[PDB]
Write a protein that binds this ligand. Structure first.
Ligand SMILES: *Cc1cc2c(cc1C)nc1c(=O)[nH]c(=O)nc-1n2C[C@H](O)[C@H](O)[C@H](O)COP(=O)(O)OP(=O)(O)OC[C@H]1O[C@@H](n2cnc3c(N)ncnc32)[C@H](O)[C@@H]1O
Ligand SMILES: C/C=C/CC/C=C/CC/C=C/CCCCCCC(=O)OC[C@H](COP(=O)(O)OCCN)OC(=O)CCCCCCC/C=C/C/C=C/CCC
Ligand code: HEM
Ligand SMILES: O=C(Nc1ccccc1)c1ccccc1[N+](=O)[O-]
Ligand code: SF4
Ligand code: F3S
Ligand code: FES
Lengths: 613, 239, 102, 138
């Protein structure tokens, strides 16, 4: 602990994360005139938004005439009424304005004949409040939308005096008296530890897909900010809600976009049946992400596989014109050939439902402010913010609508910037930190560097990943989830039993992957316990013991002829999960979803209904 | 039980005058993925965890795992291992770069050069920005194809001999191609003054059409041709 | 703003197409006026040619100033030496013809 | 931090350290284009040195050209040697000329795909061999 060089930095704002959300927040703050640091363990381009393919949602109405309130309806209906409708209002209203802003920065969107941003059909979207067929509102840069999004965002961020701490691993939040003061972080390049303190702190560290053995997300998506929050004793919301993307490569688990299915693509099983017509009649193979995967998983269970094990399904692009495949989806054309050895125009792609998105995360306003649950009521944590996948304003709720995450990144990244902007002024007193503050992080850093244990990091990571893949898959039951909970809690007790090898200062990847493992465990532990606790089939969480959707009312039959269930009995509520870091105990409580929009007269509240596409 | 040998460059800056050396790792290919990164990860996880390298997407999209595999600069998650067991794969860090540790090169100068060209739209009237979408024809969109896809892996610039001998003052294919990206984007107004920034003997003119860049590009792009396109523009533009 | 690096490059290509055109032209009709233009085109293209080799390899400033001066002196001595050969002797063209018929 | 300051801090950091440069020419994959550029430089230097040696010695050394040939006549006019001496002068010229045209085609922006480099790369070698053996017979 006393062997570590500590360099204190003084800033106005700190953004942990250089993804899409992280960047927009970062240079958005610098634009407001704030001295902003941006802490990132990767180079901004390497961040996992780069891998995004499908597109970004906006009701700009470039194909046919559209309205943003129809996009609003689709999201709340997509969220299975766990979505906070105040945040969904703000996002879908900003949707056109935020995409135009990006195009004005220099995002090379695909073009129409009219010269406008090319929009595409995507899963879950409809015209006229779910009455007028399929909606075309997915703005895209061919197949590399996330790639172009991040690059032009980074490109633009060079116009400001934003101090980028590149390849710096953030360890924990600098917290004093329930108020955020900054971040303590490891510099990977020379092993030194930096105290970057700021009046306001934005957490945008993205998802935690690496908790599972089969994910589309990068090796780096390890939910680090979500962990720094739980290590501060602050709650984590809706973590049991993990999105399983229908179409992913059978091999390494790489993504084949939902844009494939929005461009006339068909999902075909073992027999050759277009099975997404036996399950979903109205929206078909362009339904919600949780519904398609539910059909896909409950097709393999029947024994209707494909390969030498018979465990996957096919996405057929044999019928689509070759010219359309080159212009609209060149990215999956290469990766299908590279990873699966498949010609997209002559053969189908072997697909599998794999972990993709984490709609859970750090509880958030529509303003981006981190919330703590005190006295059964909501309270704003002073000087702490969260946006992107790491956050949970629950714009997505129980199931994320396709092509809405890149939107979330921009809208709330901007909102985090504006929340600080119209809150205080740059040059306001940066609160003083204690001379010792952050001992625990360095204490942890030191013992994990010299960890001469018995269980190698690799083996414990794999034990967690396989246990998560077996116990909390698409379908989950109380019997299996319980054995999972005991299994994950066991593996948490192995964190002092771990063996590390690399003992250097400069670029100790062995150390940071183990640091990632601590973070991954905390995220996994909360995901599994909340899943066994929740006794319903809402969104992507599907209990076979409790097949029904448990609301305050029975919304299938007429309203008002009923007595309202108390908050104690129904399940239309947010899961707030805590963990006592010492013993790994998951104590969890709940808060109600927001139904009121930002202005009833402008955007009517959509009450719960029967949901099936 | 198929065994493949890997000869990997190693260096530890925290080992008191440690010499740069090759270390060999032997791996069963049946318990391993097809790509080189799958092998690197396996030896990291099972054999030696002191092996330090950059990786993220394992999809050939982020550009983290750029290194010199068997002579050429490529992405490790994209180049599948040669199944021929009688051969030994030689893995090196990116040519003519300062080694921080093992297969991790210093890209600080590389990124700094990318900053100096200004990779963002520049309009003469930016007072009306953010309101309405800038119009660009479908044909003007096709001109950016082959250019935007670059992930900044730095395989090309690292393969350029001119970039070896003059890394300080020459920008290299990666950055140059991007400077060209913003030259032929119909939305950009600063096309002339972007060319005038290259009016020195080093920034652009150190290219000699050695074509190692285009040859090595893991994304299949053609930076050298785009560099030749800048040279033509530099002599043709008026005022 | 002056554009000097671009014109220099265009200059390199102009003398090249000349030197290309002049080698069959000198064979076609080996006259005295061809000998001088042949000497001028050879010496310039060689000066700019080596000029690059210098700017590519010669590191720093100390040797940079010397190598560009030493190349210039060589070039000045080379062109003057060829004109002397054209004026007082048989000239490049006739010299090749004699050397080849050997 | 500006783009210029980042570069200063790159060089100050690295040069004042014990970091090694990764191997470059020692390991890199040898290809036809890369080798054909070295030869274009090799020929360029040799030919310009040959041109200079001719002009310089015509300004310093005594005697005229007619006399200079006569002393390189009385040394056995071997058909196995005189041909070879004449072939070794015309060879670097022809290579640099043929690859020179290829450079000028490139500068116009044509033939810049890898299949177009390996095709024209052979053609340059073939046109060199034929024209060098051909002009050694005129
Ligand atoms: C996985 C995936 C997701 C995806 C997609 C395709 C794939 C394969 N396609 C999408 C699409 O077409 N349209 C869309 O709307 N979304 C799509 N997604 C989901 C979406 O891309 C992600 O949710 C989004 O990329 C998340 O972005 P965000 O800005 O929130 O964060 P990030 O991109 O993952 O970047 C994380 C950054 O945080 C830094 N970091 C992380 N931990 C630390 C610590 N330890 N210390 C310091 N910095 C840290 C990283 O450096 C990184 O920059
Ligand atoms: C400084 C120069 C140093 C000279 C030494 C270099 C010698 C190589 C020159 C290559 C050209 C070979 C041509 C063969 C030939 O038969 O033509 C000569 C003769 C044909 O019979 P002919 O009586 O003209 O018959 C044709 C009918 N008119 O007569 C001519 O045509 C003379 C013209 C030749 C011009 C080429 C000079 C280019 C110098 C290259 C410098 C390379 C440096 C090494
Ligand atoms: C008539 C046929 C010739 C043509 C078409 C030609 C043209 C060229 C071209 C296009 C280049 C490369 C420029 C670049 O890097 O893009 C070059 C290089 C060069 N040439 Fe020639 N040249 C010819 C003959 C000669 C001769 C006879 C000499 C000797 C005086 C010579 C001396 C040089 C030198 C010193 C270089 C520099 C090497 C380099 O930078 O790569 N060339 N020439
Ligand atoms: O260095 C060059 N060749 C070379 C390449 C690899 C190893 C050794 C030499 C070369 C060749 C032609 C033009 C310009 C250069 N250059 O970069 O200075
Ligand atoms: S052009 Fe190719 S080799 Fe060069 S930086 Fe881009 S992807 Fe890498
Ligand atoms: S490898 Fe280098 S010389 Fe030019 S075309 Fe190429 S950048
Ligand atoms: S690791 Fe992302 S490109 Fe190879």
């Amino acid at each position: 602990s006393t062997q570590y060089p500590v360099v204190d930095h003084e800033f106005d704002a700190v953004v942990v994360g250089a993804g899409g959300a992280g960047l927009r927040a970062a240079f958005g703050l610098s634009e407001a005139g704030f001295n902003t640091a941006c802490v990132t363990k990767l180079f901004p381009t390497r961040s996992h938004t780069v891998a995004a393919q499908g597109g970004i949602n906006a009701a700009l109405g470039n194909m046919e005439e559209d309205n943003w309130r129809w996009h609003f309806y689709d999201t709340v209906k997509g969220s299975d009424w766990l979505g906070d409708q105040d945040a969904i209002h703000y996002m879908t209203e900003q949707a056109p304005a935020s995409v135009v802003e990006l195009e004005n920065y220099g995002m090379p969107f695909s073009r129409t004949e009219d010269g406008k941003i090319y929009q595409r059909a995507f899963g879950g979207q409809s015209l006229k409040f779910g009455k007028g067929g399929q909606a075309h509102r997915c703005c895209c840069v061919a197949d590399r939308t996330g790639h172009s999004l991040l690059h032009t965002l980074y490109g633009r961020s060079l116009r400001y005096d934003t101090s980028y701490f590149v390849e710096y691993f953030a360890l924990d939040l600098l917290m004093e008296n329930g108020e955020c003061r900054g971040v303590i972080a490891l510099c990977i390049e020379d092993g030194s530890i930096h105290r970057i303190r700021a009046r306001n702190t934005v957490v945008a560290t993205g998802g935690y897909g690496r908790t599972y053995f089969s994910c589309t997300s990068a090796h780096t998506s390890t939910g680090d900010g979500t962990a720094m929050v739980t290590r501060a004793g602050l709650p984590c919301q809706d973590l049991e809600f993990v999105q399983f993307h229908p179409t992913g490569i059978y091999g390494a688990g790489c993504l084949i976009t939902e844009g494939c299915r929005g461009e006339g693509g068909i999902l075909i099983n073992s027999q050759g049946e277009r099975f997404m017509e036996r399950y979903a009649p109205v929206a078909k193979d362009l339904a919600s992400r949780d519904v398609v995967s539910r059909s896909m998983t409950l097709e393999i269970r029947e024994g209707r596989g494909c390969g030498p094990e018979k465990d996957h399904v096919y996405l057929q692009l044999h019928h689509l014109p070759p010219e359309q495949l080159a212009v609209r989806l060149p990215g999956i054309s290469e990766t299908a050939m590279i990873f699966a050895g498949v010609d997209v125009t002559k053969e189908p792609i072997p697909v599998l439902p794999t972990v993709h998105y984490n709609m859970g995360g750090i509880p958030t306003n529509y303003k981006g402010q981190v919330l703590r649950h005190v006295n059964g009521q909501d309270q704003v944590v002073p000087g702490l913010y969260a946006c992107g996948e790491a956050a949970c304003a629950s714009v997505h709720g129980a199931n994320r609508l396709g092509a809405n995450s890149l939107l979330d990144l921009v809208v709330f990244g901007r909102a985090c910037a504006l929340s600080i902007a119209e809150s205080c002024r740059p040059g306001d007193k940066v609160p003083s930190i204690k001379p010792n503050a952050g001992e625990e992080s360095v204490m942890n850093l030191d013992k994990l560097r010299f960890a001469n244990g018995t269980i190698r990091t690799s083996e414990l990571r794999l034990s967690m990943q396989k246990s998560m893949q077996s116990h909390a898959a698409v379908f989950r039951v109380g019997s299996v989830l319980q054995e999972g909970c005991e299994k994950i809690l066991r593996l948490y007790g192995d964190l002092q039993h771990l063996k590390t090898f690399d003992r250097g200062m400069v670029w100790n990847t062995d150390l940071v992957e183990t640091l990632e493992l601590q973070n991954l465990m905390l995220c996994a532990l909360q995901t599994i316990y909340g899943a066994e606790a929740r006794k319903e089939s809402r969104g992507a969480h599907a209990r076979e013991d409790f097949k029904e959707r448990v609301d305050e009312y029975d919304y299938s039959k007429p309203i008002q002829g009923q007595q309202k269930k108390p908050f104690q009995e129904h399940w239309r509520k947010h899961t707030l999960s805590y963990v006592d870091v010492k013993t790994g105990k998951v104590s969890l409580e709940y808060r109600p979803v927001i139904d009121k929009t930002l202005n009833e007269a402008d955007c009517a509240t959509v009450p719960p209904a029967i949901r099936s596409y | 039980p198929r065994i493949k040998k890997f000869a990997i460059y190693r260096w530890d800056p925290d080992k008191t005058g440690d010499k740069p050396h090759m270390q060999t790792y032997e791996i069963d290919l049946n318990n391993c993925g097809p790509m080189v990164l799958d092998a690197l990860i396996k030896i990291k996880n099972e054999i030696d965890s002191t092996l330090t390298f950059r990786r993220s997407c394992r999809e050939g999209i982020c550009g983290s795992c750029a290194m010199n595999i068997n002579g050429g600069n490529t992405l490790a998650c994209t180049r599948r291992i040669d199944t021929n067991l009688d051969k030994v794969s030689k893995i090196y860090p990116l040519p003519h770069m300062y080694v921080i540790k093992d297969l991790v090169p210093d890209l600080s100068n590389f990124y700094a050069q990318y900053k100096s060209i200004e990779p963002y739209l520049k309009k003469k009237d930016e007072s009306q920005e953010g309101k309405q979408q800038y119009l660009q024809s479908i044909e003007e969109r096709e001109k950016l194809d082959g250019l935007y896809e670059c992930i900044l892996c730095a395989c090309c610039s690292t393969s350029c001999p001119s970039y070896w001998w003059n890394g300080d003052k020459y920008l290299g294919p990666a950055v140059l191609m991007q400077a060209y990206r913003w030259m032929i984007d119909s939305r950009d107004d600063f096309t002339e003054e972007r060319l005038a920034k290259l009016q020195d003997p080093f920034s652009l003119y150190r290219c000699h059409t050695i074509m190692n860049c285009t040859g090595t590009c893991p994304k299949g792009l053609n930076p050298g041709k785009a560099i030749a396109e800048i040279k033509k523009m530099m002599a043709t533009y008026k005022e | 703003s002056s554009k000097a690096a671009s014109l220099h490059w265009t200059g390199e290509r102009v003398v090249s197409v000349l030197l290309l055109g002049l080698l069959p032209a000198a064979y076609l009709n080996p006259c005295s006026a061809m000998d001088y233009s042949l000497a001028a085109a050879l010496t310039l293209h060689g000066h700019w040619g080596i000029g690059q080799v210098v700017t590519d390899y010669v590191r720093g400033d100390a040797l940079q100033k010397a190598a560009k001066a030493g190349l210039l002196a060589l070039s000045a001595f080379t062109f003057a030496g060829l004109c002397y050969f054209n004026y007082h002797d048989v000239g490049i063209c006739k010299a090749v013809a004699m050397l080849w018929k050997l | 931090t500006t783009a210029k300051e980042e570069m200063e801090r790159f060089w100050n950091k690295n040069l004042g350290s014990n970091r090694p440069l990764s191997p470059h020419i020692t390991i890199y994959r040898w290809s036809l284009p890369m080798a054909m550029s070295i030869c274009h430089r090799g020929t360029g230097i040799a030919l310009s040195a040959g041109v200079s040696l001719f002009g310089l010695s015509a300004l310093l050394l005594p005697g005229n050209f007619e006399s200079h040939l006569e002393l390189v006549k009385s040394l056995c006019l071997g058909p196995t040697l005189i041909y070879t001496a004449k072939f070794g002068i015309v060879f670097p010229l022809m290579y640099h000329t043929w690859n020179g045209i290829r450079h000028l085609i490139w500068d116009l922006g044509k033939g810049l795909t890898i299949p177009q480099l390996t095709q024209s790369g052979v053609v340059v070698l073939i046109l060199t061999v034929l024209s060098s053996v051909g002009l050694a017979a005129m």
